[PDB]
Structures are given as structure tokens and as C-alpha cells.
Design a binder for this molecule. Sequence first.
Ligand SMILES: CCCCCCCCCCCCCCCC(=O)O
Ligand SMILES: Nc1nc2[nH]cnc2c(=O)[nH]1
Lengths: 239, 28, 269, 133, 249, 40
Amino acid sequence: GVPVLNTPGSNQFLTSDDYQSPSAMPQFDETPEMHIPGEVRNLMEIAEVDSVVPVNNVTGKTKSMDAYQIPVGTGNTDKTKPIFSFQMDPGYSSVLKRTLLGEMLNYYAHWSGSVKLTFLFCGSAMATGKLLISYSPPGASVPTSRKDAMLGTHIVWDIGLQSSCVLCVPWISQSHYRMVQQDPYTSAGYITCWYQTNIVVPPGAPTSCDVLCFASACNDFSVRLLRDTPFMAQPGKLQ
Amino acid sequence: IQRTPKIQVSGFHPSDILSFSKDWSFYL
Amino acid sequence: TVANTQPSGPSNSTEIPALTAVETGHTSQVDPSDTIQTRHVVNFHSRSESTIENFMGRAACVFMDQYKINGEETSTDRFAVWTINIREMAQLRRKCEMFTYMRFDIEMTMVITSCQDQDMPVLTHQIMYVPPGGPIPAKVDGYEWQTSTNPSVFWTEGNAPPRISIPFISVGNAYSSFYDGWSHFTQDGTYGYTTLNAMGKLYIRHVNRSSPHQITSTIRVYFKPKHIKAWVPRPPRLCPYINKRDVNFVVTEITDSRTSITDTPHPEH
Amino acid sequence: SLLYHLTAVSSPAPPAFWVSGWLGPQQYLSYNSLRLRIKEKLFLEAFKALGGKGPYTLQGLLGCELSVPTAKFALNGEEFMNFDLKQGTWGGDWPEALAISQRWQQQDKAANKELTFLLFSCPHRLREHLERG
Amino acid sequence: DRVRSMTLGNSTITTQESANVVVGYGEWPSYLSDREATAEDQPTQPDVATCRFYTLESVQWEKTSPGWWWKFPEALKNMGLFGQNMHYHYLGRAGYTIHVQCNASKFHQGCLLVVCVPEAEMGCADTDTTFPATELTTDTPHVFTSDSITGKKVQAAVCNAGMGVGVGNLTIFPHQWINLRTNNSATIVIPYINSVPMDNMFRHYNFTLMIIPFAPLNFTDGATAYVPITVTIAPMYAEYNGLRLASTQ
Amino acid sequence: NINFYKDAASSASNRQDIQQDPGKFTDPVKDLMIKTLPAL
Ligand SMILES: CCCCCCCCCCCCCCCC(=O)O
Ligand SMILES: Nc1nc2[nH]cnc2c(=O)[nH]1
């Protein structure tokens, strides 16, 4: 019949090919489609949802809820020290990599887009505060004073009735994409927090409050290469 | 169930008091 | 494509896009155009790789087992059984359990290899699918193998791997990655998603009757979900898997730890 | 009429599993867990599937008569599950029956081990005893 | 928009310091439609008699409490005619308004994650065995634990919200927060979520409601030490098929 | 775009389909929340 020439790549099983193959059950009448609420069509729909960020993932606290609560307090000492500081790197930063954003990212090797860090003040309704949340692109080192941090992309969070503030990490990068793993070429910078003024409380309110951080992707966020997550390992056969 | 250990030790349940009958009741 | 960056200038107003309330269960829709001065960026990035079709559209191994060609007539080592499920391999299991309900077709591909130890030119294998309730083979040469309605694939080595499509064969309107409930109405019996797993069994054997020396073939089944619909996403599995039958886990820490809340690894020491 | 009388106890006083093999009215084989070993593990795995607190006793009657195989089981002196030779699955109506049946089929070939035991290895050894005794 | 008033049967819920209402997956409960039905008998729709606000037993928020969970609709057995229709029918199907109430002074502080988890299938604390249904279902609800427990019960270490996941990632489910400085109530309107048109209201827990304090409750001495958390839940568009003799559970 | 088999299960994956509705997870709130306005 038709003279054919088998080109290279024949009789191979590439796990990423989409070919038509004979069905095992011809004319199978599957179950009718039902409408189930909450159909997800893209992983970026999951990465766009806020998830509590364990900023306080210090040793011994990563099996508690203390991992999540950022302690802020009314006190005249160490007001010059940063409230918290981590690498803005949602793929490999231990602070961010296990959130929904970081979990979706790890299944990928490249990422791109803006990350919004939302900070929820969980103190008294009588506690007032102002915090400077900063983002420093990776050129210089980490800011070690509020003066070095106010020079970057920052926002002064006036704690009031709204209870939450958004620091948008605005995707300042030299390349269109960054690596999800760590490499110096695609470093994304640092997130630092500082007391703008202070947490001030009445005589009967608790003098120390907690802040919760939430990470999510923005409208321009996307992930590119598809890779196996380093988070799941199977040392042996299951049971 | 529980059974009365009829002594002639057999036809009882549970075991602590060795095989059992079609009754599932043990005896020694 | 993803949304472009709009130009934004200096602002001094009562609009507060950065001030929100996470208490509402609402994720803020802020983009950098609302918090800083941005430039117009015509963004051409698209989320094509992300989609559930591409995310799950990679053939993953779901079952590895071996079976000998020689043995006593009634030997059960001469055929392999699977009891089809997607919980045996942690990678595809974790990918599928990021959604509560899924509805896909399976593109099954098998990779059968031969292991010998110190002359049969090539072996033929039969992979018989036994839907729930069908007669299961007692021995490799049992009558069931003469599949009359069980779908079966035959494959001699050196050829392309065997590959078949499977429709969406659940009695429900979707596959359940999780089932918080029991098999019996009295709230006992089996707890969990093993209650809803009513996909058949997979029997694999050598169609060759015998061999001079013992040969151990290993079959690797590769599932690739296609035409996928997924509902109700869930947090990805944090803890390592223990059993292929339940959600049992050992308490795993939330993320890797640091030394202090301001511990930021920096190069410029 | 070859017959195996298997027993298992969740809470034994210091033999969690012991077997008595019979040919009709005479006992020839005795097995204890301290000193079938695959069904010793299969029986002790059954208590991990029951989810209850109180002590359980699992019994089995695995055997054959000239060939007919009996695969009956009792939970606390009450027959709760059977072996279905066609489907090759342990079967009962009680929730405990399905729970133990599922825990045993997780082993992924224990169903075929049981079916071969009842279909070929019990009749074979029964006739081998009939000839040698 | 802080104030909100919900009327379902002969019951009204008022709240003055509330966030928005969360409609689970942006869908409002509805009756099963003829194209998606499979059970052929006529459903019973006793709207006001069962689709009304039911108040569960309160729990006491403490400075160290790690959280609570309720499994629905099973927690609503013997809760009025809703529980009766659960007993007498084989199938049931309903959406729910889960109103969680926790008021406290302006000198208190704390934050709860009030989340509805569809199919919150949980793992046992002893990972080779299993647990009875009494370790999952409620009366009083089950509590999470700060540390990892053992036994034939749910692994309630709150870091893994009984499900072997990150507890901080539970916000992928229909959730809200009760920040004692912002609101004193959380409302979640969850529709019927399942892989089948209807299901048994007893052997299947369609969703679990978790209240988990992410910021612990704190107050100085003189402030009210007793701060309860009340869960009021109302079925919605409830219907039942396969009426038979009543269950005995 | 050609199907050589009669069954719909025996096709390739729908790789070109890119659609999404992130509002059912990010804005599942009943009353609409305009971004520039106060949340409460
Ligand atoms: C020789 C023909 C082989 C037929 C194989 C039938 C394949 C069974 C169907 C796959 C079941 C997938 C279940 C997914 C459950 C889940 O989403 O968690
Ligand atoms: N209060 C209310 N909100 C809806 N949103 C969509 N449908 C409805 C309805 O019927 N009542």
C-alpha cells in the first residue's frame, strides 16, 4: 500500500506526547455531567488565593501555629530592628515556598509576575500602629535599617479599621521569568518590616499583638516549565 | 457472644479460660 | 495572555486599594498599578502550562510489579494483580489530591521489561482488565484469560509499549480524591476514599507457557489523565504518605525552619 | 475432609495466633505464632482494621472435602464473613466483614493466595494424605 | 455593610460587626434539577420546617485552645425535623448557611479561621490502624491539639489540620476570619458539594467546619475570661428521596 | 483536529483550552467588594 518511512522517534514512549489511542471500552456511556461548585481550570487560580505565610518559621516553631504569627509589641527597645525579614522568592524561600503560591510554583521551573503580601493585624481594636513593609530588589544587600528599607518599594501600613494592608511586590526583574529554585541570576530581593511609629495600646489592652501575612499571585502571574515538585518524596513502597 | 464453659472445658467463648467446633466455641 | 501592567502616576486620594479586610474571605485584587507608579507593560505571558489539562497531562507511573514465567502450576508469582488505584505512587497521588473531585479519561501505557539472572527470544504478555465482580484467574493458565468480554491487550517485547484509552468509568459524576465517610450506613466498615474506589483489577502474565531458565518480567503502568475536569482544589499534601489506602500521616512541620524571624540569607557578607 | 482451625486474639495473655489442622476427626497439624505464617500476618492485620476498642477474637475454618472448599470466618464467636471463590474476595454483610476484607485485599495478592489455597493446595494435600495415610 | 440579618425559617440572625458573607465557590444553594437528578421518586421539600437556623452547643475559646471541628450534615442528626428527615430518608441534599458567632471587647484580641472543608477526610493518629466514627462526629465538637497525639483517633495536631496538609493553606476552601478587632461573626453560605446528585446524610460527611485560632485569644486581667464560640448552621434548599423506615442512629 | 477512533475517550488532551474564573476562589464574597473602596 502507501509507501511510508519511519522517522526517528518511532515506537518510543515520550510521557508528554498527546496521541489518540484505541479505547479499551468502546461505546462506553459514561456518567452524565453534573455541575459541581468550584471547578478549577488553572493552577494559577489556586496560586492567586491568599494563604497564611509562616514568617515566624524559626526552629522549634514549625509544628505550631507560632510559625504564622508575626509578633509586634508596644515597647521602646529594638524599635530600630526589623520586625521580620525574608527573601522575596516564592519558590525556595522557606517562608513562602509552602504556601499555595509556593506549592503551585514548585511544580514548575520558571515563574513571573507580581506577588501581593497581605498583612492582617490581629491585635486589639484599641491598638494603633504604623508599620513600614518594604521590598528591595536584589542589587544591594538586605536592608539593615528602616532608612535602607524605605528606599525600596515600600508601604506605610496605618493600622486602623481596615485591619489589612497589601504590599504588592511589583515584579522588578531583568528577565521575563525567574527560576523557581535558587540561583543568583534570578534573585528577586528581600521583604523587610519595620516599626514606622509603634504599636500603642490603652492601659488595659494586651501589649503584644500578632500579625498574619498572606501571599498570593497577581493578575500577571504565570509559571512556565513543568517539573516534579521536590516536596513529595517516596522513600519506598506504600502500604 | 459469651458462652458457658460446659465441663464433662468445652463449648465456651471467648478463648481465655485449643480448637473450636462448628459452633465457633472453643474446647480443650 | 496574563493581564498587562497599566501606567500609574502619583496618587493622593481617599481611594485605598492597599487597605482591605482579609476577614471577608476575599483575596485583594490589587496589582502594582495601585500601590506604586508603574509603566505600561504589554504582557504576553500566558498560563497555558498551568491548566489542569497540561498539569496532569503527563504520563506518571502508577503501578510497578513483577511476575515470573516459570513456577509450580498453581504459583501466584507467575501473574501480577493490581487492583487499580492512583494511591500507590506519591507523585501522581499528590497531583490528583490537589482537587477533591476529578473527571478524566485515562491514557494507560505499560512498560514491560525482562530481568534475568545467571534462550527465549522474545516474550508475549497479556494484560487482562477484570471489571469489578468478574471472575479472577486462580492460576496463570486459568480459563478467565480467554477473555470474552474482559478487555485485554497482548504485547510481544521489542515493539512499542502497549497503550489504551479508558473512559470516565465511575458510577458517580466525578472521581473522588477524598471521601470523608464510611462504606456502611451505620458509620463503620471502611473509612475514606477506598469506599468509592470501584475500578477493576489488572491481571498481567506471560502468554508463553514456560522457559528453560526463570525470567522475571516487570510491568510499569503509566496513567495520563486527559479531558480533565477538576473541582474544589485542596492544599497540596504536606506530610509523606504512609498507606495506599488512607489519609494517615505523621505530623510534618509546616515548612523548613530558620534561626530567627529576620534570618535572611544574603550574599554580601 | 481436611480442615484448618485458625484463631486470633487482639488481647492475648502472656499466643496471638494458633492453628489446628484436622483430617476429619483427627488433628495432625498445630501451629502457633510464637513458634500459615502468611495467614498469621493476615489475621493480626485484621484487628488494625476494626477501629473499635474492645478485644476481638477472629476464627477461621479453611479446608476442603472431596472438591469442596469452606472459607468461613467468625468475629467474637459469630460468623461474619465468607470467601467468595468466584470474585475471589472475603465477603460478609457486617461492617466488620467489609473492613477486614478490605484490609486483607490491600495485600494485593492475598486474595489469590487464599483462592489457590482452597482450590488446589488443600485438595492436593488432602489427597496426598489420603494416599500416605 | 457591617450589619447583616438573615432570615431562613422561623429564625433570624442579626449581626452588627460582621465581614461580608462568603458564598462558597460563588454559588448559591438550589434545588436539584431534573436534568441532574437520578433518584426517580418525588423528593420531599419541607422548606421552613428544616431549612432554618440551628444553634449547636457552644465552645469556650481559651488562650491555648488549638481549634474545633464539626462534621456536617451528620452533626445535625436529632436537630429538629432536619434530623428527622435525615433518619427517615435514604438520600438528602442541602446547602447550608454556617453562621459562627464570637463577640469580645475591644480590649480582647485573637483571630479564628472559620473554614468549610469539603470532604475533610482525616487520618488516624496511629497510622496503621483506623478510628471509630465517634472520633470524627460530635453534642460537643472534637478539638484539635497543639501537639501530635496518639491512639485510634484523628491526628488532631493542628499544624496538619487532621488532613496531612498545611493549616495555613486551608484558605483555598470557603472561609472567613473572626478578627476580634474587626468582626464578631463569620457567615459562609456553602452550596451542595458532592460527586453525586444526592447522598446519605449519615455515612458521608459532606463538609467539615473548622474553627482554628491563628492568633491566640489574649486579654489582660479584668477582661471577660469566658469567650464562647457559637456555631449556628441552617440547611438550605433541603430535599430528600428514598423515604423508608427510620434509621436508629 | 482529526479523530481516527469512534470513541471520545480515545482522543488527545485539550491542550489549547485556556480558560479560568479565579473569582470563585478569590472573590467568593456575596456583596461585591470594589477594590478602591473600603472593604467595610
Ligand atoms: C485493558 C484495559 C484497562 C482498563 C483500565 C481501567 C482504568 C480504571 C480507571 C482509572 C481510575 C482512576 C480513579 C481516579 C480516582 C481519583 O481521582 O482519585
Ligand atoms: N439572598 C439570595 N442571594 C442569591 N444569590 C443567588 N441567588 C440568590 C437567592 O435566591 N437569594
